[PDB]
């Protein structure tokens, strides 16, 4: 089928269409996208049936065509192409097809838990999901320049295709040619972003809930194959608990639970799930191993240790994925303050923390600091030297500071989690007014309950009703359980209120507004 | 499979993944979305393995989930579901299952030509072409509640399948559900707002060239199976040209051949097609015909005429659509200036203009304004009022207006078109440093070619070239013809530049930036 398709590359040349009006919210479907692998450039052919959607002229870049990984206009982790005559094949190499449909992405850091769990596993698992086919069908193609990195058999679960790296692509040809090519990531399952303009914290707007999250973990558990206990996730190399046999024996006391170690050095992740899975309660200093807790069971607990001057306030990835509505999980943060119990490594290379580099009035300032100033990514001096101290714990305040959230036994000792759904609007909404004196009056408001509302059993259905002047730039709310409502001492006569109705499951679940009625008395 | 459909429905829930982080910008892909006849409301069950994507929660009612049509955030065009646990189809008649997979959209006017096009046409094209096998296999489902309207036809060109409005769907059962559905339409393509916010103009930032445009029009040409002249696109119901002949001889003295006249109402919409297929000049009165200028053929001229009171700066949905980039189209306006030309009809009803149940105080300001104001959408008498007049077109006055632009004969001729595309980045940019005092000091640059340039004969290169003192805030930059420079004045010894560089086609088409270069003097 050679010469068929390259008649349609030859003739046609590139077809583009991607959803999004900014490069930050793109998503590409590319039909005779080509690469180079001497330029490592990909290649749009002008023919003539050649589609670019969105055409944006030399606005294209200002700054590029999308991000091709999930962190937010990252300077090197820009997509785009330059742009060919399709007749310019004339002085190429003979193009090399590749069979399967591609989805062309980066991975902002292959070696990291979290990254590769937060920015690229997840949102690789719906973006393939966004498109017909492309969960069974499509291979990935990894074009950021890195190896495989610890991780990569993580990677090998989310398709049933074997990934390739761009280090791969120059062996399989100089010109490769997408006959059916899916470009970039989609961003709606981030819950945090890594201060390169604002200083770190959890993303303005999360569009992701915890039933996402665990649908996902869900899928992975299969593919990885996968009494009540604490669990406690070690660190071997670095940002270490020095008194980690003192933390499991007094564990186990406090809450009369078996403890149990786990480590990422030491087990298959297979088997960090599995013990992951079933725990009652995740103790764990600070570190890309807490993603993980994205498959603790609904209503465990994560505790989280963190390093003297580390405000737990200022560093929250884990604190965010534990508190996603849905996610179900108790957060305790743990902070060391006693400088006593922390452990300073400050002849290091500036990679690992270590201070020895800067000169000494800087070193002074930092020894002093007890609390890491609010920074921006990625080295910070004063950062990297406490986030990697290790920390004798101190017990009892551990103890106490976990107690003010888990009070009793910890874990899903017998609790049930219902779905959280919302009304739907009032129909129907009426209203009648009358008057019985100069400044007597009464309006009467009426409405059926929604629709979604005759299939559903509510423990409490409420109903706020905003009234309104018609001139007043005010509303007042009132609540009611009736699905009718007479206002009389509120009320004026010879006047004009607008009336808006929603209902509101339980107490925090809102419905929308109907439309507004118009009231005149 | 029915019974395995519902025991899918019924266990796992409705699956959603959708693109875009607003509600503005948002294609959504459904699995076991289902719809109520009877309520009409769209339903999403929760099931063991439903996803929402984005998970709002009551930001879903915010206003809504997305747009159901391209006019960004109307009101009465959103889209939303109700929410339901899978459990409760039981308390409910047995499902419909939707064979074909659907695209469910909104038309926003079915019966305007312009709204067509714009609004539904080369949106529902493009989107059907954004997912994978949608074009050949999905059947299009128009909820917002019109009639097929004066031009189905067009909208049955789009799919092999029939599409289906909203108040069929009660007969095919009380309630429906689509194995595979998709909802909303993509906004690439639009170029025009219609004034709900600010008053009527071009889009912001318009992501479509005339090269979609014109492969869009191919398809509708050979779906309708579709001597040099200029075309007259006459009206006959309201805002006719009164002087038809005049101006119709005066054209054909003025240029050289034939001018022809051509209707919506006269013709079959393949021949209005086809008459403006050929036409090199096409001349027509503001109005929903002009949108058929996109079937113009590279290189004509159109001419826009406008009532007496009419500014032709303040209505340009065809204006926009003649000067895109890639269409390659004249565009000529011409305004009534001479008030005895125009004839106007003040006691036609509301829906036609005139001053008719407005205060006679309000005439009197309509019957002397000289310019009908900036309004925002859908209400203005005055408006309406001025838009529907005849006009008696000043021959004299218009001849010169078109000989501003068109110089000669108009039409293509036999022109040569050729796309324009973009530089690449330069490569392997270099720099070294010479000081021969402590004032003087000599900074080279040098750099390759952009790798697409090796295939490509272009008139005009040429490099600029951005220096900065590292620390300043300011740079000068230089416009050079060489692949190498040598800088000499005003170079600071001892000192780190910041060397930017980018490549330029034919003086306009403005490459991008090369990583930046750090020179050290
Ligand atoms: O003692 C250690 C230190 C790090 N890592 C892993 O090595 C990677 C890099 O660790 P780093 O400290 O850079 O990440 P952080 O924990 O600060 O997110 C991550 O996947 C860690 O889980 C590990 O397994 N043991
Ligand atoms: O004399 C007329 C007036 C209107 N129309 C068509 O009827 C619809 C409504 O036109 P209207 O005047 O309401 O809007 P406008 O033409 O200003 O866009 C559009 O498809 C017009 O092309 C037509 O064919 N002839
Ligand atoms: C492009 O070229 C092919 C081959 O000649 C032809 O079939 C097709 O109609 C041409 N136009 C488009 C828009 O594809
Ligand atoms: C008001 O609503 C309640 C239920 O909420 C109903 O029992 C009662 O009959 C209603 N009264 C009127 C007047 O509609
Ligand atoms: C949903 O439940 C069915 C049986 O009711 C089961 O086979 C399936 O694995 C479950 N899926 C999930 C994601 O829990
Ligand atoms: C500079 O660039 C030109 C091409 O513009 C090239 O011919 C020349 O060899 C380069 N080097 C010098 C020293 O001119």
Redesign the interface.
Known sequence: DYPKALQILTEGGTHM?????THT?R?C?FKWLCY?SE?E?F?FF?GN??????????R??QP?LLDLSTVEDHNTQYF?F????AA?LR??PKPVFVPDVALIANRFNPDNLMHVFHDDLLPLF?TL?????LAREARLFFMEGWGEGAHFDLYKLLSPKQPLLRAQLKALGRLLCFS?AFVGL????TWYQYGFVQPQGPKA?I???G??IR?FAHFLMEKLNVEEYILVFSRTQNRLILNEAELLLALAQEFQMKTVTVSLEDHAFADVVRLVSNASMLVSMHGAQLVTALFLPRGAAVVELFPYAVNPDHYTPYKTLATL??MDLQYIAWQNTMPENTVTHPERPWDQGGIAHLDRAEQARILQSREVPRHLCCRNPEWLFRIYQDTKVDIPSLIQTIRRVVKGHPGPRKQKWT?S??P?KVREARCQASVQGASEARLSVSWQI???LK??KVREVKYEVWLQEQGENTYVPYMLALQNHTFTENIKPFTTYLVWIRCIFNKT?????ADVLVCST
């Open positions: 269409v991607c959803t999004g009006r919210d998503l479907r180079s330029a450039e290649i002008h049936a050649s589609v670019m959607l969105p055409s944006l002229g030399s294209r870049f590029a785009n330059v742009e060919l005559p310019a002085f190429m719906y999901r966004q498109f017909p086919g059916h989609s961003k709606v399952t707007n569009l992701v809930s039933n996402e649908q509505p849905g779905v759904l919302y739907g929604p629709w979604n299939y559903l679940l809102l419905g929308p507004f």
